[PDB]
Design a binder for this molecule. Structure first.
Ligand SMILES: N#C[C@@H]1CCN(C(=O)c2cnn3c(=O)cc(-c4ccc(C5CCCCC5)cc4)[nH]c23)C1
Length: 206
């Protein structure tokens, strides 16, 4: 494993962004967080993050026990909060098999899951491989609201205290066979005001 994905399914691109209202006159967009995938990864023992993802029904521990462990990843984001406008999300997956994907995204605060988003995406055959595009999707309102409140905070260390208790758990399944294809745990810090967004992908091990 050398990227975010397995032998069956790769997450090739993901962006959470805002376009300022004057993007019509001169186009610009700000990337809060971004993964671009257009030597093996470091590992992280899944026991360490078990408390950040609530030990509740359907949670990370339960899924990880079920396996297969090669499908489980941790992504650390350093979010760029230095920027109303259009708040948007884009993602792209690739596979070599034709599948219908069910993508579940669970947003958690402290212990509890707060919101969940479920999407189904069909494959398009492009150049021998199957692509799953969900581009320019409207960012869910809970997180648009979270970002506005987050950047009202007066100190960088306060944003990290808030983001310490903030996680996203993503589960991609083959809708027709119900087998898990990918499970990614997302944890967050704020990047210093000088540095743009950055990310690091780990394999989850036990
Ligand atoms: N992490 C993640 C996974 C990666 C793939 N994901 C999606 O494909 C996806 C789908 N729907 N959707 C949303 O409506 C909102 C977000 C989103 C917005 C803002 C931030 C914020 C960034 C700054 C710090 C607070 C969170 C983080 C995430 N991501 C996604 C979500």
């Amino acid at each position: 494993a050398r990227g975010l994905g397995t032998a069956r399914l790769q997450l090739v691109e993901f962006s959470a962004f805002v376009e300022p209202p004057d993007a019509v006159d001169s186009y610009q967009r700000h990337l809060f967080v971004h993964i671009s995938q257009h030597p093996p990864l470091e590992s992280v023992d899944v026991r360490q993050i078990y408390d950040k993802f609530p030990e509740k029904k359907g949670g990370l521990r339960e899924l990880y026990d079920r396996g297969p462990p090669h499908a489980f990843f941790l992504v650390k984001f350093w979010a760029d909060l230095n920027w109303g406008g259009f708040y948007g999300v884009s993602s792209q997956y690739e596979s070599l098999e034709h599948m219908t994907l069910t993508c579940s995204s669970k947003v958690c605060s402290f212990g509890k899951q707060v919101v969940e988003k479920v999407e189904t995406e069909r494959a398009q055959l492009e150049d021998g491989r199957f692509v799953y595009r969900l581009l320019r999707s409207p960012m869910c309102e809970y997180l648009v609201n979270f970002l506005h409140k987050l950047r009202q905070l007066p100190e960088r260390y306060m944003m990290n205290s808030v983001l310490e208790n903030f996680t996203i758990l993503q589960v991609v399944t083959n809708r027709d066979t119900q087998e898990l294809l990918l499970c990614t745990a997302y944890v967050f810090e704020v990047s210093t005001s000088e540095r743009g967004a950055q990310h690091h992908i780990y394999r989850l091990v036990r």
